[model samples]
Every structure is written in C-alpha cells, then in structure tokens.
Target: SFIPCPVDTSQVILPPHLEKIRDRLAENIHELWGMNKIELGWTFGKIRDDNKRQHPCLVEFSKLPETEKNYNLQMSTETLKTLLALGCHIAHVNPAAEEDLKKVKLPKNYMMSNGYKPAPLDLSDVKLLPPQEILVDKLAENAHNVWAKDRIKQGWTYGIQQDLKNKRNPRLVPYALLDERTKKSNRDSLREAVRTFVGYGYNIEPS
Candidate 1:
C-alpha cells in the first residue's frame, strides 16, 4: 500500500520556512528510503520540477498532513533525545542501566540542539534485562522500574527505555509473547511504531 514519489518533492508540500532546509527532508527521505525505487515497491522518476506555490526562503505556518510530513524531523529528533535521556537515566540508576542505554547508541547530529550528542552504539552490547513484566505489572511498578530510577538518580536513561517501550506498546504486546529472536528481528517495526506514537504528539519526557 506504500508508494514512493517520483521525485523528492516532500519539501514542495512543506511550509516555505522549511523549504530552505529542503535538504533536511531529502536527507531524511534518503535515510528512511533509498535511491532505488525498486526497494520501495514502485518505480519513481526523479523529477526536477520547481515549487511555485511558495518561496524557498519564505516561512509559512501550515498544518502538516497525516503522513510523514506532519511530524517533520520529529522521528530522528525525538528518537535521539529519548535515547540520550534514557542512557543518562540508566547510568544514574544502577550504573549498569547506563550500559544498556548507551548500547542503544545513535548517529552523530541526531539532536544537537538539545545537547544530544551521538553516543557510541553497539547493538551487541544491548541487553534487555528481565522483569519485562515489571513495566506491565502495575502503574506504580512500571513507574518504579522506569520513572523511579530517575528520582533515585537523575539520568533519563530508564525514561528513554520506558519511552521506547511505550513506543512498542499495543503493537509490541504481541511481540512480548514471541521468542527473543522474533522480537529482535521486529525491533525496527516496534521502534517505528514508537516513533510514530511520539509524532502523534506524545512527549516521552517526564512532566
């Protein structure tokens, strides 16, 4: 049911203010997708049409559509922020928790604005500690295992993991019953769901 545009015209549909950073949209598209249309299930031609509705440097405040456009850089920005805050949180708690968060490493320039520095990521180093049920046991239990760590310590690491878990919520529920390998293979699917949830206007950070 997914289709790729012939050209990278996401910017064309975006607000003029975001046009200047058109490359950002392009870059994101590239990351989310690739140059090969075959990979996307359709053959899209790279059109070279110019945008006439708006100026490249003009700033317009318009609502984004339900598609990827609405969130606008939110996928990477929020993911990076949550990841960093989670890593720091775990580090604050058991110190061991930090290792798991750090293991979720991110790319450089993920959330530079929020002082989010790209940490080294080694998926191999990641270990989803047991007590997975803790997050689902009770609101207080979930809060204790997740949010409470932050109170006992000041790292947002657990919070990030908690956020990631929240991202996996609903959909991830099915994965919970599956074996570890299936869950790992489907991690991306789960993560994407989480990112989408955040994009829907949910803040992973503590209020």
Candidate 2:
C-alpha cells in the first residue's frame, strides 16, 4: 500500500506523490537499514575526495537477466551517487521494491509545516527593478533546490548546519562553507525565515 503523502502546497511545492516519495526515500535510505549509514557515508567521503582530485565517480546501470526471486534495490548505488552529487538522500523505489512497499502511520501533527518549501521565494512586496522579486524567488528556490534535491552535496543535515550548537563537530566542514558570504547568508536566511513563519502562527523551529 503506497499511501501517498498529501501535497503540501505551502511547503515544498512538489506534487503529492513526489513529496511522498521524498519522505519515503528519506525514511528508507536514512533510517530503514542500519549499515546504510556508514556505507553511504563512505561513498560521500569518496565522492568528495575524488572531486578534490579532479576525478569523478561514475555510476551506471544496465538491464540484466531477471533473477528467480523478488528484487527491490530501489536505491541504486548509481542513483545514490547522483543524489550524493545533488546532496540529497531521496531515492526512487524500483518496481521490485515498490511492489512490496507499505505505508506507515504518522505521529501527531507529524507533518512538518515549518519546513520551508523548496523556494523560488514569493516576495512580491519588494521594491526593485524587473521586480527583483522573481529573480530573488528563482535564486532562493534554486538554492533550496540544490540543498533539497541532493542534500549531501550541500553536506547532509549535520554537515551543513550544526543545529545543536552544543554538539561536537561532525568531523568535516562542507564545501558549501568555502564561501563565507554564502554560509552566512544561508544561516541568516534560515533564521529570519523561521521567524517569519512563526509570525504566521505556525510553531517554528530551526532544525
């Protein structure tokens, strides 16, 4: 039973199923299997290192003869490589796995509303030329897309932002931090955006 997550027009702007897929991918890839974390973490480190060396990791797939058993390798290493490049953990469940997938119940108010939808921000009230609003929205949205599409490229959540200010560093600084302005802007934007959402009567949180 692939119970789809409802469309959150107010959040990520994706169709209902895509958003559901994203949530499912995050859950499965990040939480389902235990060894997935350490192994995938190594994959990420390898990719990062290869990039620094001017070499790129290659991932490809070809149809081979079907096996005699049920197959569900929805999150392919190749696909995971792409997601890693984009920096997100989302995965496309293959027919093999989709055939057996089931929906899980959500907790109270489990829908994370405060989370900013990947944005081309809609700030029409700004005074600017060419209505910089559109450009701003596009830029903001694109930036969000970069992080959302492949969060790992932005450095998985922990590597991107140290939300726990009190916790120890996750052992590496993301390439995203190479630009001081970019880093500061992202941090400030997130801070202000949370405040704005809270003003709208939604409970807001930075994480």
Candidate 3:
C-alpha cells in the first residue's frame, strides 16, 4: 500500500560547481549503506544469498554494476533535491543531538514562547508529587506498547543495545527488562501527565 509519491523535486536545480559534490555525496551514501550492511554480517559474493547474507552489490561504488549503481546515485540525487526544494539547508556534515539543539536559533514567536510569554510560569519551586504506583506502572505499560508496536511495524526486533547501523534498539524488550534509569524517567513522565490532567481540573480516581 506504500506508493512512493515523493515531493516535487523536479524544480530543484543543483549549482554547476556542486554537481560534482552531488556525485561525491552519492558515493558516500553508497559507502555508508555498505558499511551498515557489513555490520549486519553481509559479505561480497558472486551471487546474492539471504541465508548466507552474501551480496554481489557489496563492492565499492565504482566497481558496482550500472543498474544498482545508478539507483544508489539516484537515491542520493533525490535526497539532495528534496531537501533543497523544502528550503532546508544543511550546515553540518556530522551532526550530534545536543550540539545541534544548542546551535539552532528559535524565533520569538515560536510555539514554546507562548509558555514563556510576558510572564513565564514560576517553575523555580515546582516539584512533582508521586502519582499512584499502579497508575505509574499502567502508564509505562501503555507507553511501552505504543513504542514497541510502532517498532514492530517497522520490521525491528529486540537487540541488547542501540545499533542504528543495523536498525536495532534495546528498548524493544519488555518493560520489566528495562534498566532502573529508563523506568524512573518513564514514571516521572507519566506522573507529569497525571499532574497536567489534575491541573486542568480533571479528577483521576482509581477504577
């Protein structure tokens, strides 16, 4: 049911000087994908074999056949054009979570600004009261399933740690198997949810 209706990237034009850069980026994308496959136990062979995880296209970008090689370059080309068409300019070659967040400038009229308006809420002395133990467990259980269900749909399985290179996540395991730190954070989040509801004058009584 997934029909690929990508954006109208036809209007996006690459600069003459950067056309070579587009090719270079395609090579990198191919190399990056190859690296991920290698990490997932893929190896170069005469014929593609799923059981042995052997692939003929595991070679370098230049050594690859014209058909698959053209597809790799097309993937790179489409990505570049789509981003440009969307008015999203890339400033970072290698970005990190915290660093990127700190550098991104937020406008004064941003949505979060409504919370910190002319008078910001006094959160200096704010502390969350503990939500009921049963509710906390129930909320965490609900949250886990919401996330796990989505991951399952994405063809993911439980792994011991985060392996983006291999598309695996440690959190796919049961809530009981989660570390105390993760559990505590989820509990805090659920407790805050109850607090928000109560603040809005909703009575949340145990069933």
Candidate 4:
C-alpha cells in the first residue's frame, strides 16, 4: 500500500536555496530527474491533493513502517546533490530570508579540466577500395566465384543485404544486387567473403 504526506509539498516552503530559483525552475520536476535518479534506482512522483493538483511525493518499496519519511529524506538529499553539481548552490546570507540558490557559471575549460576527448567515428563498414595486394589476398581466401581476380581488374563494389523477414539473414553481395536481378550470387558464401574482405582492410558499403 502507498502512503502519502498529509500536506502537499507545494504547501511547504521550498528550501531557501531552491526557492530563489523557483521562478527559473524546470516546467516540471521530471526534467530534474536524470542520471542521478537512475543511478539511485528509485523514483519520486506525486499524489493528488484536495484541489486535484498533483503534489510531489515519495513511497516505500516494501511493507515497512514509517518508510515514507525515509524515502522522502533520501530523495531530497539526492536532489540537493544533483542541483549542487549543476551550478546550483546556496549563498550565505543573514536573516535566512536572504539565503538563496545562486547560479554558479560552468567552468570555461570544463572539457579540458575533465580530460574529455571526442571518440573516433566508426567507419569500418564504410565502402572503400582495398589496396591491390590485400584485396587479392582476401578474394583468394573468401570469394565464391573463380573470377575474383578479373573482378578486381575492374572496380568492384562489395556490400551486404539483409532479409527483412529474417533479420539474422545478412547476405554479402555486389552493389548491383539491387539492380542486376539476373546475377544470382550465393548469399551464404558471400557472407564469409565480406567478413574476410573487411578483415583485410576492404571497406563495405551499407546493404
């Protein structure tokens, strides 16, 4: 069974720090939930109030006594931590009313400070012509037809086609497979052929 707080959260004053940014808050609390809550393995939502407005609340996982308070406390703590990380911080103030959530500008060199680097784009499946030597080697080992050497003499395009009905049925075939309906090529054999070609630096266009 789920238990809810007797009072709506909106009725309770938000923490002095968070209240300062109340005007600039997300349209909904859900926007605030992201990696932090995902990592926490719990969710926070809301309960309907007398006026039919939803007020944010928390619940317990099991049949435990007084668990709602603990749940709320845990989520509140996590929210505070997440907001702090996003440049939201409490400003020191007198008379408490002056205390507010101050926006801390992100560091100008954040990426450099975090040691982040962009990853290399994956181009393994991109169509490319292999060097004559590697191309010959791969064809000799994996090509189904005896005319691989002859095909290499002319510019040959290698690619694979997938069976829509059977997703696992990926067949390596020539680029003309889409147009040259008369040229029937063995799909199973070509599968191995394409794999061999790619292993030797031959690039394949998307099928």
Candidate 5:
C-alpha cells in the first residue's frame, strides 16, 4: 500500500520482535567476547585492566556502557542486513504463532488524515559469520534495482535532491554512482523489511 523510501541505517530501529532478536544477538556477542577473554585468563574487574586481563564489560550485556553496547548492537543490526541481502525468507509460521502474529496494535489515530504516526516496526537481534558480514554491500546494490524499478514506473528520475513530491533522487542512478549516504538508506530499508517478516516468528530460509 505504500512506496519504498530511502532509510537511514544509523536510525537502527525495528519492531518489537526484531528488537528482541537484536537484543539476544547483542548479548550473545558480548557473551562470546567475555568467554574468549575468560579462556585467556581474564577476570571481572571493578575498573579497566589490560595487563591483568580484567574488564568491566565482562559482567553482563545489560550493564555495558552505551557506546560499547552500541558497538554490538550495530554489528547485530548489520548481520540482519546481511541476511536480507542473502535473499532469506522469514515465512511459513507455526500454528499459534501464526495467529498471534496478526495482533499488532496500531496507534490510536491510525486512520487520521494528517500528523499521524507510523507503525514503528523498527528493531533486530541475530548472529553472523565473517563470510555473511561481507554480504550486505552485495545486496545493497540490488536495493538500487528494487528501488529503481518502482520509482521508474512511478515516473521518477534522477535529481540532485531526493523526495517523493519531486520524484527525483540523486540515488536514482546506478548502484556504483551512489554515495555512502545514499547506499545507507538502501541497506536500512531491506534490513527493516526482513525484520517485519521475522516479527511473525516465521521460518527464515535462504535461496
């Protein structure tokens, strides 16, 4: 019912379900890091310690500082992006899970004319291997294909500035022609789309 728009990867939002996934993956990432440190003879320290093999983040995922936590959060986010790039399908739901999935609550002014809020299906958690980590850019180029196809049909064309009303986007050009900022939206949009299906607790399969 809506057309695709460029999204900002730094926005880093997801629906509740996807948010839970991201949280789990971020915690697990920290867990693996802590485990590796522990195996290397590291211990919990009240303060920072390099030579002593001690640190604060070894405590818990919840206790980590914002910047440090965000490091894991960002990686988890990109891992989801990578999966989306790989053409994974998060469908074929379970019995009760299928019914429960439709129970999303829209805002009170869901049908309002103007100044309305969107269903904030913004969130993620997931793990990945190094091989998958390198895949987002590969499909990010495909983002150009999907986005361009629709916009081209909508009579959109390239312009210095990008907007719906103008139907002209600097990113309308080829994938290589896009700058980092432009490519960011494509990555974000695909990742978020993948999260939407995952919210239903469906199976994810790669082609």
Candidate 6:
C-alpha cells in the first residue's frame, strides 16, 4: 500500500513489491550521487547535502543502514515528484536501469501552463485614418488574422488570451487610441491591444 508523505507525496510499502522499487530507486541514487550534489540537492533540498561540498550528507552509500537507505531513496522520490509537480518541462520518472524517465503525452495543464509560454508578440496597432471614424471590428479582425497567420508559422497552437473577461473584441476601442489628454491612465488599452495582436500571432520585432 502507498503511504502519504507530508512533502506533498506518496509511497508504496510491500516487501517484494515495494522493496523491489526501493532497490531500483536506491540504485538510481548511487548513479545520481556520482553525477553531482546539485542535481540531488535540487530535488531533495540542501538537507541531503554536506556543507559547501557537492555531495550528500553520507559519503558512503554501501555503509548506510537499511532504514537510512530507504529513507534516502524515499526522499529522492519526493524530489522527483516535486520537480515533476513544479512543471519542469524536461522532468520525468525513471524506472530501474533507465537513463531517462518514460515519456508520454503530458496533461493539458502541464502542457499549456508551463512557464515557458512566451509573452504575446507586440505588433503595430490598427491604423486609424483622418475620417474621424474607427471601424473597430474590421481593425480587430484584420489585425487578429494577420497575427494568427504569423503565429502559426512560429508553432503556437492557441492564439487568443485565456481569460474571457480580459479578451479583446474588434468593436472595442484600443487603449492607445484613448484620449491621453483627458484622464490619467496606465495605457491599459494600448497594452491589451498589443497583447491582442500577439495573441492573434503578430510577430514582435526585438526592441
């Protein structure tokens, strides 16, 4: 059966069934221990390491007691689970004797919410002419289409902002076009337009 851990994790504990996995994980610890301490520390935190040295608190793995070894391995698994939870794109789970964790299609939140998502590209806003009339709808659609096409080339699957309330509509007046002379503002509209352009796939030139 699996025992829940306070470190936001769980573990299995049945002799041959659980013992077999721990042995495998213990083996992994030995291999990882040789690579460097930072790798281990990143997962298990500094408690597992010795002062300033890039090694674990225990210098000798074979010398550790059965209880100690199991504890270490359990902590290592906790580290692995934490790294996976934190959304490390390249993070993975390793079975016995594997160089890397098994790979599979990730869940939606993991795939979509990864911190690597690039900020929307900043592009030129809708150009208003001297006609004193702004066809906000045409401007938004035209701008969105242009940006969308460009974004497709860049390999982003979704273009629009995720929040419905904050989403842009073509009929809305862009912030940049708001009267700067009237009231104090944060150019929130302009920022949104820029985001809108980016969401639709507009490529922003390097500033």
Best by TM-score: 3
Regions more than 4 Å wrong, model 4: 1-64, 98-207
Q: Better model by lDDT, 3 or 6?
A: 3
Off by over 4 Å in 3: 1-4, 89-207
Ranking by lDDT: 5, 3, 6, 4, 2, 1
Per-candidate TM-scores read 0.25, 0.21, 0.42, 0.18, 0.41, 0.23
Candidate 1 lDDT by residue in tens digits, 75-154: 33333333333331111112233223322334443422223222222333323333321211222222222222322244
How high a TM-score does candidate 5 get? 0.41
What residue runs in model 6 are displaced by over 4 Å at the alpha carbon? 1-15, 38-60, 65-67, 76-207
lDDT of 5 by residue, 10-29 (tens): 44434355566566556555
The candidate with the higher TM-score, 4 or 6, is 6
Residues 88-207 of candidate 2: C-alpha lDDT, one tens digit per residue:
333233434343323333333322222211111222232233332333333333344344434344344334454433432332333333456654554434333322222222221111
Error of 1 at 22 (Å): 14
Local accuracy of candidate 6 as per-residue lDDT tens digits, 70-141: 766654454334322333222123333233223223233321111211112222343422221122222233
What are the lDDT figures for the candidates, one per model?
0.29, 0.30, 0.52, 0.30, 0.55, 0.33
Instruction: Give the worst 10-residue stretch by lDDT in candidate 5.
Output: 110-119
**Model 5 steric clash total:** 11
Clash list (residue pairs), candidate 6: 147-200, 147-201, 147-202, 148-200, 175-189, 175-190
Which scores higher on TM-score, 1 or 3?
3
For residue 21, what is the lDDT in candidate 2?
A: 39
